[PDB]
Design a protein around this ligand. Structure first.
Ligand SMILES: *[C@@H]1O[C@H](CO)[C@@H](O)[C@H](O[C@@H]2O[C@H](CO)[C@@H](O[C@@H]3O[C@H](CO[C@H]4O[C@H](CO)[C@@H](O)[C@H](O)[C@@H]4O)[C@@H](O)[C@H](O[C@H]4O[C@H](CO)[C@@H](O)[C@H](O)[C@@H]4O)[C@@H]3O)[C@H](O)[C@H]2NC(C)=O)[C@H]1NC(C)=O
Ligand SMILES: *[C@@H]1O[C@H](CO)[C@@H](O[C@@H]2O[C@H](CO)[C@@H](O[C@@H]3O[C@H](CO[C@H]4O[C@H](CO)[C@@H](O)[C@H](O)[C@@H]4O)[C@@H](O)[C@H](O[C@H]4O[C@H](CO)[C@@H](O)[C@H](O)[C@@H]4O)[C@@H]3O)[C@H](O)[C@H]2NC(C)=O)[C@H](O)[C@H]1NC(C)=O
Ligand SMILES: *[C@@H]1O[C@H](CO)[C@@H](O[C@@H]2O[C@H](CO)[C@@H](O)[C@H](O[C@@H]3O[C@H](CO)[C@@H](O)[C@H](O)[C@@H]3O)[C@H]2NC(C)=O)[C@H](O)[C@H]1NC(C)=O
Ligand SMILES: *[C@@H]1O[C@H](CO)[C@@H](O[C@@H]2O[C@H](CO)[C@@H](O[C@@H]3O[C@H](CO)[C@@H](O)[C@H](O)[C@@H]3O)[C@H](O)[C@H]2NC(C)=O)[C@H](O)[C@H]1NC(C)=O
Ligand SMILES: *[C@@H]1O[C@H](CO)[C@@H](O)[C@H](O)[C@H]1NC(C)=O
Ligand SMILES: *[C@@H]1O[C@H](CO)[C@@H](O)[C@H](O)[C@H]1NC(C)=O
Ligand SMILES: [Ca+2]
Ligand SMILES: [Ca+2]
Ligand SMILES: [Ca+2]
Ligand SMILES: [Ca+2]
Ligand SMILES: [Ca+2]
Ligand SMILES: [Ca+2]
Ligand SMILES: [Ca+2]
Ligand SMILES: [Ca+2]
Lengths: 570, 570
């Protein structure tokens, strides 16, 4: 038995007498709370055991279930330099010294064959009389042989004359522009850029505002000021957006225009839409109004491109298998490519050269190019390809075009004529889109939604930029130097409806269905249509709000720290 | 023919002769530029057409291809009232005002089986003699026809006596409570809630700061202010987050603690991690430091729940097919349910009642309840279920439990004992998780990535809250009233290691792989481990920046307008 101050629970466990009937089941057999004193409340009041309340006793045995359990009824009524060597050896073009008896023995001994790069003989001959431009080398047998200083090599048709190597013959020599010199070279930066030299090597750097990355996410377009590593709101409350492209400040406003497609869902067709994007840090939650261009019968716009010098918008519909061109306001639709297309994935245009490029991801993947007016169609790659999701053009390096591939998991480039095919990125974890800017190749891993960065030449290591939802569909660099804004428009106001580009000059065209009248080739039978302008957007600087007056003209206020009509002055 | 000053294209098109040699291929043919004399540069300085530059003749024909073409080396040197009854009508059951002649003709004319009430024949009677309780009508040949006064129903035996209704029983009568009274009812808001009336009717507004939403994605966890509509950063850079739960403000320091499970990635085990959350508004100014509990052999913790009273954490694992418990610092792991489990998906705990609930979404789905100590396991719902991926408990409405399906995509509610199953929400677009707060019920449509909302009783209609991502795995409401903080811990420090809870009391238990000391039920032969303390948090408020010194303690770079060790003084 337990002590006087302890209570024997039924199982034998001794419980301190204080814990008995304290309101908690304190031992396994639950007998520390069994046989507790009844709940006395007061005279004249019936306590229902299920609540603990004390209802009047006049409510007992009246056939009304007054308490939750009704006890009133049922209960009561119940690296060193190149090593020198003696004259019995020779310093080859390669960084080594090889014995002179291995020279003019007619067997390669220092890799570059420099030991027998044109050995010469002659009874009248001496090495140091006149044989080649820079240096010759003599051996005691009477033979003699020449070599050329770095940056030079003996001529192929005459092994006694030094000729310069054009260092631009190699892909990865300089950023931007390689320029050849006799025995040397230079890597001067193009206008707008600046020279810089970083840990991995020389680097050409842009100017002005830092680049932005525009990221469509099937519901929103989100900005990323890459030098601040912060996001900004921009467009929202949209659905099934698939690809975007922009035109840089067409009206000299400080407000570029972003063109984005919308996929068709169910029985509602898709459309291409346009809206202003602030070139200014005003990434605040300012109102953004999109405008539909009104292009009908769109079922899957998969690729989109903007000709900023011709003021045309090019796109391709994978389901309908057409590549179409129209003005930026959606007028004068025109079918360019209508045959031999199974699934046109993405397109890009080069108005400087008048060439447009596109990819096919259907049964027989291929990459094709043609004139921007639809003529001179040709192929570029037809082997070792699958699902070429997208391509972009590096206008600053001989207009070489890179493209992505999510079946070979590769990124590789080619010149605009189809030559110089090189592999750039391997193991790119399903790249779905890409863009090239200032050497940095950006691409999107669709299976996991990361933005990845590497040098466009592919001679560095990968870097992860940021991670977003798998709704990410494309990466696009939003910067002034992305497109040469100063490219002159060759059109001479001769065409009536459309003035497409071709390599040099231009070419007139009619809207789809209408033809030229009597072979005029400038005048079409279709009636001309008025241009479509966009409503004035909010241009407020330094993070001001935006309102609409009684005239619904967007006028906007801000903090008085900055003043002006548009919050532009300090 | 063409004019004198107009050049002729060979197709019959006449164009101004100024376009000759202007630079662009104007004609449809190329003759507009073909035949143009090239620009003259200088004598003795050859202009290479491939670049547009002029080069001295000494550099020319040196076998160095100075220009890209290299031709310099080859060719250069070649109701108001609801129709109330008068004396001429009959009330029938509760207002069916047809003419009076339905009185006790022994025919069910009213349609409702209340046309004849009383109706005991005999001409010499009036119930004013106290034959029926209240509100008779005079029977023409039987004295009394006695329908019950409003708020009452007739008893089976002695139908002349009317039983009071129980209006608290009917589902969805008041948002929070009820008080059955004599022929009437009164309903009120429980402690912590303020009475308000919307355009529809009653609302019990929770006091204090407005509720938040916590959205865990595979990469990050995002806060949301249901009243301000602005997001917040919280935890970032993490990977493979599945489900979360929190413990409100344990130390009164002003910071709750958020627990979240991390899946197994590749061939590497997952973990359960915890971190502070600022109850006060803050973001990007306090770095968030997560810590690991240290639970090995963990693959897929789809279910996590925090018992705020006993200070235990309950989680399930789909791969191990078992449910385990441990302290909030990862000590003393113990298995609770180990048999007849296919895929334990979600879990919830009710310390006040002493019951914890889990859902199984295997080949034979079921929803079960058991004591926290692990006994009295039973099946609540097995009929008509498919993939019950979610689970929530409404601690206010008689501890009712809700769950979300994914095959039948309904949301249902049932009492904790398993009776009165109701289908609260239909066609819920495959909900994945639940959380019931105040008046409304929240759930996540997984594929669409949208957070939705409805009145928790199923009345009215749905409403989109916000859209995140296809990565959204849960929604959990964050507020101090979500878990009643004033529930007293029944444990009395007599148990070493785990002190589990049960209906009405506690129970001591030993960690896994160890037993009690023989002859004892409060002590085990295993050792004990010291509690694992939290690292000090960044408590900065109002935008103050946290900072780490040589001591690595968090301190504040407090913002303007506020003073104090962090920012606590206005
Ligand atoms: C992305 O993030 C990066 C890093 O955070 C940002 O740098 C970048 O844009 C930055 O945006 C701010 C605000 O618009 C710019 O501030 C302005 O800079 C002007 C020029 O500053 C000069 O000197 C700095 C020295 O470091 C040099 O870096 C700059 O390149 C430049 O040579 C500055 O003059 C200007 O104030 C003038 O204009 C006001 C207009 O009202 C007047 O009131 C005021 O009196 C004065 O005359 C302002 O401070 C910032 O320059 C810019 N980036 C940089 C550093 O150049 C972010 N981009 C986006 C899209 O957000
Ligand atoms: C989620 O969204 C809600 C609503 O926006 C936020 O709630 C706000 O929280 C801030 C910070 O706590 C509140 O700001 C402070 O309010 C105090 C008074 O509160 C009452 O009056 C305000 C008037 O604006 C009401 O909005 C509020 O609801 C109460 O009725 C002020 O006294 C504070 O300033 C004064 O005290 C400080 C003390 O240091 C001094 O320094 C100041 O000089 C001054 O004397 C301050 O203004 C704000 O009021 C809250 N608004 C509402 C509507 O709730 C949540 O903060 C947000 N997220 C969460 C949960 O953090
Ligand atoms: C973006 O495009 C512009 C053209 O809008 C490029 O500027 C012109 O580029 C051409 C071809 O490289 C140069 O010849 C131009 O320089 C001058 O050209 C005239 C003949 O028109 C010569 O007589 C001059 O000696 C001089 O060479 C150059 N300038 C213009 C406005 O015509 C520009 O290079 C390009 N920039 C980038 C960043 O791509
Ligand atoms: C959160 O839990 C606490 C309990 O931990 C709840 O407080 C409780 O409120 C009820 C009703 O006011 C109290 O019941 C009353 O008890 C007294 C005797 O103490 C009795 O005379 C009354 O007739 C009535 O039964 C209860 O004592 C009280 N508990 C404590 C310790 O304060 C609180 O309501 C809960 N909140 C929510 C929203 O669930
Ligand atoms: C070879 O050419 C170099 C210049 O690179 C010159 O300086 C050196 O003297 C030459 N060597 C001989 C052996 O002529
Ligand atoms: C009978 O019911 C009416 C309301 O319909 C009420 O006004 C009247 O007082 C009741 N009569 C009695 C006797 O209770
Ligand atoms: Ca007790
Ligand atoms: Ca009663
Ligand atoms: Ca040799
Ligand atoms: Ca050279
Ligand atoms: Ca011309
Ligand atoms: Ca030459
Ligand atoms: Ca009748
Ligand atoms: Ca009642």
């Amino acid at each position: 038995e337990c002590g006087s101050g302890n209570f024997r629970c039924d199982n034998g466990y001794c419980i301190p007498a204080s814990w008995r009937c304290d309101g908690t089941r304190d031992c396994l057999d639950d007998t520390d709370e069994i046989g507790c004193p009844p709940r006395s409340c007061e005279s004249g009041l019936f306590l229902c055991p299920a609540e603990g309340t004390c209802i009047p006793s006049s409510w007992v045995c009246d056939e009304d279930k007054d308490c939750s359990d009704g006890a009133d009824e049922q209960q009561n009524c119940a690296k060193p330099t190149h090593k020198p060597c003696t004259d019995t050896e020779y310093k080859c073009s390669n960084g080594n010294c090889i014995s002179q008896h291995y020279v003019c023995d007619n067997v390669n001994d220092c890799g570059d064959l420099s030991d027998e790069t044109g050995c010469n003989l002659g009874d009248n001959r001496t090495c140091a009389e006149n044989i080649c431009e820079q240096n010759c080398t003599q051996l005691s047998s009477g033979g003699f042989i020449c070599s050329c200083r770095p940056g030079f090599k003996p001529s192929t048709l005459d092994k006694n004359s030094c000729q310069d190597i054009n260092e631009c013959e190699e892909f990865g020599i300089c950023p931007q522009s390689c320029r050849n010199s006799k025995g040397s070279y230079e890597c001067f930066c193009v206008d707008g850029f600046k020279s810089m030299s970083t840990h991995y090597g020389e680097r050409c750097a842009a100017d002005g505002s830092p680049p932005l990355l525009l990221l469509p996410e099937n519901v929103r377009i989100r900005k990323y000021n890459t030098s601040s590593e912060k996001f900004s709101e921009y467009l929202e409350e949209e659905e099934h957006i698939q690809t975007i492209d922009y035109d840089w400040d067409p009206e000299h406003i400080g407000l570029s225009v972003v063109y984005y497609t919308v996929l068709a869902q169910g029985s509602q067709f898709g459309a291409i839409k346009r809206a202003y994007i602030p070139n200014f840090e005003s990434g605040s939650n300012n109102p953004i109004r999109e405008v539909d261009l009104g292009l009908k019968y769109l079922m899957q716009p998969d690729g989109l491109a903007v000709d900023w010098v011709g003021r045309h918008i090019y796109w391709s519909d994978a389901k309908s298998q057409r590549i179409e061109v129209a003005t930026l306001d959606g007028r004068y639709r025109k079918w360019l490519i209508t045959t031999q297309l199974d699934q046109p994935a993405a397109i890009a245009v080069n108005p400087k050269l008048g060439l447009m490029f596109w990819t096919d991801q259907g049964k027989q993947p291929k990459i094709e190019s043609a004139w921007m007016n639809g003529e001179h169609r040709s192929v570029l790659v037809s082997e070792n390809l699958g699902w070429p999701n997208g391509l972009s053009i590096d206008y600053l390096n001989d207009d070489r075009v890179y493209w992505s591939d999510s079946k070979e998991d590769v990124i590789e480039a080619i010149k605009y004529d189809g030559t110089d095919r090189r592999l750039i990125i391997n193991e790119a974890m399903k790249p779905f889109s890409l863009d090239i800017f200032e050497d940095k190749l950006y691409w999107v891993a669709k299976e996991k939604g990361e933005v990845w960065r590497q040098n466009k030449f592919g001679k560095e290591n990968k870097e992860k930029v940021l991670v977003v939802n798998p709704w990410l569909t494309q990466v696009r660099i939003f910067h002034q130097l992305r497109y040469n804004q100063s490219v002159s428009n060759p059109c001479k106001q001769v065409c009536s409806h459309l003035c497409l580009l071709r390599p040099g000059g231009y070419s007139c065209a009619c809207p789809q269905g209408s033809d030229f009248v009597t072979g005029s080739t400038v005048q079409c039978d279709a009636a001309s249509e008025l241009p479509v302008t966009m409503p004035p957007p909010c241009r407020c600087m330094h993070g001001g709000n935006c309102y609409f007056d009684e005239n619904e003209l967007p006028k906007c206020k801000c903090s008085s720290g900055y003043s002006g009509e548009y919050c532009e002055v300090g």
